[PDB]
């Protein structure tokens, strides 16, 4: 819609069945214990009648589904009370490149422009035993049923909101089956279900699609939050990128909660790049013209909650208030070389982490070129560029300060669940 669009992967029993043997082996080792989440960021989100831009060369699959739409702030929603937090339901389309791997986040596959049609919210009581239909050029092409999903809408809302607060207007896509249908330029793709107005979108060669969807600017932070995995040589083939939901963000001198009964929660000091101008298919050579400037984040992780499905997964990386971020942006013109800046972390005044952006594996221009090659970057989007070596455990009472030379100083305080409540 206009809120964050969350989605669940591996929720349809047909896919769990199909992947059973693979999930016993590297790199998965074991089947998912918890829900496997992803996000369809704002560049993806379109309404009925808007085109799905088709990337030349690629195979693209429709992903008819339905989404629950949150009607009031949802934090630790109890399963039995879910309906009272759900405004209704909307037909949606998880448009995607093939789901060939579930190990690393599927950003190229799923976060392309216009890859998330979503329709009208309808006030139904439930979506139990609902057949979701796909038609292509007005011919029946696919159907599946929500009774075959592992977690129902109630259970998904409860499971996600247990650690990630949802705001009114946010959505959760309930899932998709193993078997999907292919779309191609010229196709008209229609999603249908009893009780809903059909959702229809044309698929168009991307070369033909006019200007990209723009958004109103709002005070930083506001935008897609991209984050890098391993990005310091401290002494891979392509970047590991994942997205962070906006409710993870908190300001300066706030608190971040350490879960009860875990072994390891660590800070991560990072240079954050903020986009200043809409960017698509930007070369490394002009990438810097699209940067507004720089800020700092503390990209916390709960190492205990890591799994090998879309890793690092949302239960580790999108927890409420576990991403301190400064509200100030230093303009790029104040920083002559962002690839020559010191990063440090202090805990209670003890220096625990130090490195330099000279050790970035993937440079700021590389990253901008890499992402804009397959999706539109918009003003206010953020790129958390990774963290050097020097991680350690932090516990309630601890004051954690991260600092990037010339960019800013960011304070945070760890607290217990008991203190925060
Ligand atoms: Ca990180």
UniProtKB/Swiss-Prot annotation:
Approximate repeat intervals: 1-215, 216-421
GO MF, one example: 5-carboxymethyl-2-hydroxymuconate delta-isomerase activity
Cofactor: Mg(2+)
This protein's record includes keyword Lipid metabolism: no
Keywords noted in UniProt: Aromatic hydrocarbons catabolism, Isomerase, Lyase, Metal-binding, Multifunctional enzyme, Repeat
Protein residues bound to a divalent metal cation: 268, 270, 299
InterPro entries according to UniProt: Fumarylacetoacetase-like_C, Fumarylacetoacetase_C_sf, HPA_isomer/decarb_C, HPA_isomer/decarb_N
UniProt pathway: Aromatic compound metabolism; 4-hydroxyphenylacetate degradation; pyruvate and succinate semialdehyde from 4-hydroxyphenylacetate: step 4/7; Aromatic compound metabolism; 4-hydroxyphenylacetate degradation; pyruvate and succinate semialdehyde from 4-hydroxyphenylacetate: step 5/7
Keyword DNA repair: no
GO terms for biological process, alphabetical: 4-hydroxyphenylacetate catabolic process
SUPFAM superfamilies (alphabetical): FAH
Cited function: Decarboxylates OPET (5-oxo-pent-3-ene-1,2,5-tricarboxylic acid) into HHDD (2-hydroxy-hept-2,4-diene-1,7-dioate) and isomerizes it to OHED (2-oxo-hept-3-ene-1,7-dioate).
NCBIfam families: HpaG-C-term, HpaG-N-term, PRK15203.1
Family: Belongs to the FAH family.
Complexes and interactors: Monomer.
Protein name in the entry: 4-hydroxyphenylacetate degradation bifunctional isomerase/decarboxylase
Organism: Escherichia coli
